[PDB]
C-alpha cells in the first residue's frame, strides 16, 4: 500500500527557511520522478518542481527558482524541498506527488496529504475554547496561525458535525466554531503551531 507522508511545514517569518520532507512507503521510490505542488489558501494548484529518477530536476522559474531546491534520498525513500528566502506569497499547502504514472497500460497517481506553510511576522498564539451549550458546539477563539483541528469525543463522533472555516478577526487572530446538532436527542481541539491541546465538554 502506497503512502506519501509530508512533514516540516509550519510558521516561519519572511526571509526565513523551511525544509519539507515526504517519506514514501509501499512504493518503489527510486524508479520514479516526484513533484511538489502547492496551493495558496482559497486558490488553485501551482506546480513547483520536479526531480527525475536520475537526480536531474527543474523548477517553476517564474515563482520559485533560486529560492527553492528539490532533492531526494533514495536510500531513505524520502523527497525533500528546501525553501529559502521565504516570502508572504509562498504561504500555501504543499503536496508531494508522482503525478501520472503510465506503465503496463494502466494509469495511477499518488499524492501526499499536504503540509501547510505560513509565512508571516505575527507571533504564535494558542486558542481559547468556550463551550456552546443548548444543537451544540465549541468556540475556538483567538489563535494564530492556521490550522486548528477539532474532534468530538476524541474522534469518535463524526455524524452531523460541521466545523466552520476559520475567519480572520480584526485583531489578526483566527476564530471558528465547530457544531453538532442533537435535537433534544439525549470537543478535542489541537493547535500544533502553539503545541496546545484543549478538551472542552
Amino acid at each position: 500500500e502506497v503512502q506519501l507522508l509530508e512533514s516540516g511545514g509550519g510558521l516561519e517569518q519572511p526571509g526565513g527557511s523551511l525544509r519539507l520532507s515526504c517519506v514514501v512507503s509501499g512504493f518503489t521510490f527510486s524508479n520514479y520522478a516526484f513533484n511538489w505542488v502547492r496551493q495558496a489558501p482559497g486558490k488553485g494548484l501551482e506546480w513547483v518542481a520536479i526531480i527525475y529518477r536520475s537526480g536531474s530536476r527543474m523548477y517553476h522559474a517564474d515563482s520559485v527558482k533560486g529560492r527553492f531546491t528539490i532533492s531526494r534520498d533514495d536510500s531513505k525513500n524520502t523527497l525533500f524541498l528546501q525553501m529559502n528566502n521565504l516570502r508572504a506569497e509562498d504561504t500555501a499547502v504543499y503536496y508531494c506527488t508522482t503525478l501520472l504514472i503510465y506503465e503496463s497500460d494502466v494509469g495511477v497517481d499518488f499524492w501526499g496529504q499536504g503540509t501547510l506553510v505560513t509565512v508571516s511576522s505575527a507571533s504564535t498564539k494558542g486558542p481559547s475554547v468556550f463551550p456552546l451549550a443548548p444543537a451544540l458546539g465549541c468556540l475556538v477563539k483567538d489563535y494564530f496561525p492556521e490550522p486548528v483541528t477539532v474532534s468530538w469525543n476524541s474522534g469518535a463522533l463524526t455524524s452531523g458535525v460541521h466545523t466552520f472555516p476559520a475567519v480572520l478577526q480584526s485583531s489578526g487572530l483566527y476564530s471558528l466554531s465547530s457544531v453538532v446538532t442533537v435535537p433534544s436527542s439525549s470537543c478535542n481541539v489541537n493547535h500544533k503551531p502553539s503545541n496546545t491541546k484543549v478538551d472542552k465538554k
Partner: protein
C-alpha cells in the same frame, strides 16, 4: 509557459443532468500518439484525485460517468449524470512541457431543491465571561441555496460587529451551513439579543433570541 484556460469557472448542475468543462491551451499538447492533458478532482479538505489521464483515458476506480475528449488545444471533460458526491473543483493540467501548468479550476455546484435552515442561538459562555469579550453565535444548519441574510438585533439592528462563515457543500445532501458571530465587550448593558434569518426556504423570516 503554456497558459491553460478553463471554462466555465463555476458550473451549477442539478443531480442527474450532464456537465461539461472545457480546457484550452496556448500550445499543442500532442506528442506521438498521446495528448498530455490530465483532469483532476479536488474535494474540500482532500488532495487532488486523478480522473482522466492522457486526454481520454479513465483512471482506475473512476466511474464510467466521467469521460474526456479533445486533441491539440481543445479538451473537454464530461459528466453524463452528475451525482451529489461529484461536488468539488476540477482542474486540467498539461504535462507536454515543463513547467507544468494548471487551469484555473472549475467549481462544480450541485443544484438540489430548496431547503430551509434550522436556526440556533448561543449566548456567551461563563468561561468566556471571565474574560473581557462576549461572543454570541447564530447557527444556520443545512440549507440551500447559499444566499441567506443574517441580521443581529435590545431590538437595535447591528452593523460592523459580526462575521460570517459558510461550510462547503455537503457531499451527501448538498446543503450549506452558516455561522454568524456577534462580538461585544457593553454586553452586560443590554437584555434582548436576537438573530433574524431570511432565506428562500422560509415563508417568513425566523428569529431566535435569548435574554
Amino acid at each position: 509557459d503554456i497558459v491553460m484556460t478553463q471554462s466555465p469557472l463555476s458550473l451549477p448542475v442539478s443531480p442527474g443532468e450532464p456537465a461539461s468543462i472545457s480546457c484550452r491551451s496556448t500550445q499543442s499538447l500532442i506528442f506521438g500518439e498521446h495528448n498530455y492533458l490530465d483532469w483532476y478532482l479536488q474535494k474540500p479538505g482532500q488532495s487532488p484525485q486523478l480522473l482522466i489521464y492522457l486526454a481520454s483515458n479513465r483512471a482506475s476506480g473512476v466511474p464510467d460517468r466521467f469521460s474526456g475528449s479533445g486533441s491539440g488545444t481543445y479538451f473537454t471533460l464530461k459528466i453524463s449524470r452528475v451525482e451529489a458526491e461529484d461536488f468539488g473543483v476540477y482542474y486540467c493540467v498539461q504535462t507536454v512541457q515543463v513547467p507544468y501548468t494548471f487551469g484555473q479550476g472549475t467549481k462544480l455546484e450541485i443544484k438540489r431543491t430548496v431547503a430551509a435552515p434550522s436556526v440556533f442561538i448561543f449566548p456567551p459562555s461563563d468561561e468566556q465571561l471571565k474574560s473581557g469579550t462576549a461572543s454570541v453565535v447564530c447557527l444556520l444548519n443545512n440549507f440551500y441555496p447559499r444566499e441567506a441574510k443574517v441580521q443581529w438585533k435590545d431590538n437595535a439592528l447591528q452593523s460592523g460587529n459580526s462575521q460570517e462563515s459558510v461550510t462547503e457543500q455537503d457531499s451527501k445532501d448538498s446543503t450549506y451551513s452558516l455561522s454568524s458571530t456577534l462580538t461585544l465587550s457593553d454586553y452586560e448593558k443590554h437584555k434582548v439579543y436576537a438573530c433574524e434569518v431570511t432565506h428562500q426556504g422560509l415563508s417568513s423570516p425566523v428569529t431566535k433570541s435569548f435574554n
